[PDB]
Structures are given as C-alpha cells and as structure tokens.
Amino acid sequence: DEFSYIDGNPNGPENWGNLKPEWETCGKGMEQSPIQLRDNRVIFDQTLGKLRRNYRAVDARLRNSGHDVLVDFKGNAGSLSINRVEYQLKRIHFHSPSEHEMNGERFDLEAQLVHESQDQKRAVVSILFRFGRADPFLSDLEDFIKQFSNSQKNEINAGVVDPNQLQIDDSAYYRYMGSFTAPPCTEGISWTVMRKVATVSPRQVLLLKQAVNENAINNARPLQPTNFRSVFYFEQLKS
Numbered sequence: 001d002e003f004s005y006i007d008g009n010p011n012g013p014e015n016w017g018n019l020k021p022e023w024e025t026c027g028k029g030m031e032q033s034p035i036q037l038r039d040n041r042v043i044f045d046q047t048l049g050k051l052r053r054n055y056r057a058v059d060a061r062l063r064n065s066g067h068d069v070l071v072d073f074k075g076n077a078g079s080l081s082i083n084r085v086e087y088q089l090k091r092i093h094f095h096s097p098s099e100h101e102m103n104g105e106r107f108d109l110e111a112q113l114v115h116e117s118q119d120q121k122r123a124v125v126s127i128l129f130r131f132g133r134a135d136p137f138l139s140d141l142e143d144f145i146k147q148f149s150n151s152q153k154n155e156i157n158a159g160v161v162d163p164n165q166l167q168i169d170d171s172a173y174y175r176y177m178g179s180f181t182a183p184p185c186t187e188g189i190s191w192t193v194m195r196k197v198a199t200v201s202p203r204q205v206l207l208l209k210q211a212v213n214e215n216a217i218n219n220a221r222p223l224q225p226t227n228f229r230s231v232f233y234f235e236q237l238k239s
Contacts, residue, residue, distance in 0.1 A: 003183055004215040005067070013222050016183050026185035032224035033178030033191060034099035041231060042174065048234035051125070051170040051192065052081045055089055057162035062144045064154040067182070067216035069094050069145060069208055077163050080115045080123055082190065087115030087123040089163060096205050098128050099181050099220040100193050109200050109208070110220075111137075111166070112181075123190040124178075127167060132199030137165040142204065148211035167198035172235035181221045195235065 003019060004011040011019055017027015026032070058075035070093045077089040091114040098107035109129040116122055129135065138145075144158045172195035179187045209217050 003067075005219050005221070006215055007222070016185065019183075023183040023185065025179070025187060026183050029179055029185060029187050030225075030227045031177055031179055031187045031229055032185060033181050033189065034101075034221060034223055035176065035178065035226050035231070036104070036223055037100060037102045037174050037193060037231065039103060039233070042233040043230055045175070045232045045234055048175060048232065050236050051168070051173055053168070053170065054078045054081070055163035057160055057164065060158050060161035062141065062156040062158045064148045064211050066154070066213045068219050069148065069211050071141070071158065071161055073161065080125060082123060085117055085121065087117045087121065089113060089115050094208050095181075095220050096208055097218060097220050100126055100128065101223060102128065107197065109205050113166075121190075122188065123192065125168070125192045125194065127194050127198050129198045129200040131202055131205075134201040135167065135198060135204055137167075138200065138204045140165065142207055145207045145211055149207070168194055169196035172196065173233070175232040175234065176229060
C-alpha cells in the first residue's frame with residue numbers, strides 16, 4: 001500500500017526494508033529478486049526440459065494496486081508443472097521498465113505470472129518485452145486498462161481472459177531461487193525467466209503507465225545482489 005519506486009525517497013526501494021517490520025526481508029534477505037541474468041555464469045541443466053504449461057482461458061479481473069496493474073483470474077486458469085509439482089496460475093503483474101536484466105540489457109516491459117501449488121509453494125514465470133508489434137494478450141485488455149486512467153475504479157471485470165495468448169516460448173529459460181519484487185519481498189520463490197524476448201507496442205506500455213500512481217510510473221525494483229546463488233539455464237537443441 002505504502003512504498004515508492006523513487007531512488008532516494010524515504011519510501012523508495014533502498015528503504016523498503018525499514019518502512020515496516022512486515023517488509024524487513026526486502027532489506028535483509030540474501031535471495032532477493034530481480035537479478036542480473038549473465039550467460040557467462042549460468043549452469044546448464046538439460047534435465048530441466050522445455051517448460052510445461054497447461055493453461056486455461058477463464059474469467060478474470062483487472063486490478064490496479066496503484067503501483068502495478070495485474071490480471072487476477074477468478075477460475076482455474078490452469079497450471080505450470082515443475083518436477084511434477086503443479087503450480088496454479090493465479091495472477092499476472094506488469095512492470096515497466098523490466099526488473100530482470102539479460103546480459104546487462106533492461107527491457108521495455110516485464111510480465112510476471114504468479115503461480116501457487118496446494119503446498120503454498122510459489123513459482124513465477126517472467127516474459128521480457130521490447131517495443132515492436134503489439135502484444136496479443138494486452139490487446140484484448142487495453143480498453144479495460146484505459147478505464148483506470150482517470151476513474152476511481154481499481155477493479156474491472158475483463159471477462160474471460162486467455163493465458164495462451166501470452167508470448168511464451170517454452171524452449172529456453174533461466175531458473176533460480178529468488179523473492180517477490182515488491183514488499184514483503186518474501187523468498188522461496190522459484191523464478192523462471194523466458195529466454196525469448198516478446199514484443200509490446202509503445203501504446204500498450206503507455207496505457208499501463210497511465211494507470212498507476214505517480215510514484216510508480218516506472219515500477220521496476222532495482223537489481224539485487226546475486227550473492228553467489230546459482231542460476232540454471234535450459235535450452236532445447238535441434239540435437
């Protein structure tokens with residue numbers, strides 16, 4: 001509710017950990033996200049496999065927390081499987097600019113798919129976007145997003161929303177253990193960042209930026225220290 005993205009503000013990212021006891025891990029944890037992703041420091045693990053997703057088009061609500069817009073699925077939007085553990089797709093958050101970097105490059109938008117197992121284990125799958133051709137997923141969502149832009153509504157029924165419109169190429173990704181990228185910054189989160197970069201139009205990102213509070217126009221947390229944690233990579237060969 002009460003944190004900013006402005007570097008050097010009292011509530012900005014470097015102080016999140018000191019704003020309230022519930023947020024302490026933001027400041028004290030050593031497996032925080034996002035991180036730099038560096039090809040020259042990854043561990044190859046072909047045993048990871050192409051990403052295995054079983055997603056369903058379900059009814060959803062657009063929500064505007066004031067610092068991001070997220071899609072919040074009502075029904076069972078399906079699931080992501082990792083080592084036969086099954087994580088249900090719950091929410092998709094939007095950050096502009098990206099929070100993760102790949103080889104020192106920051107991207108124009110990042111979408112973060114939040115999944116949860118019955119055991120309450122969390123897995124996030126991120127998509128990184130450059131400006132280009134419109135994103136098919138956000139296309140169906142644009143008129144709902146435009147509403148946030150002066151009106152006091154911060155929940156809108158977006159109708160049935162289809163997660164299979166998302167530009168996700170399952171053949172290559174990074175894999176590491178990290179944290180939520182907004183308070184409470186809880187750790188134990190499995191992150192998967194897709195190697196293939198998507199496109200989004202400037203208009204779509206404009207719409208998202210129009211929707212949040214002023215202090216969150218850019219809503220990317222700064223990169224956090226890797227701290228020697230491992231970063232796995234998988235990529236499918238022709239073979």
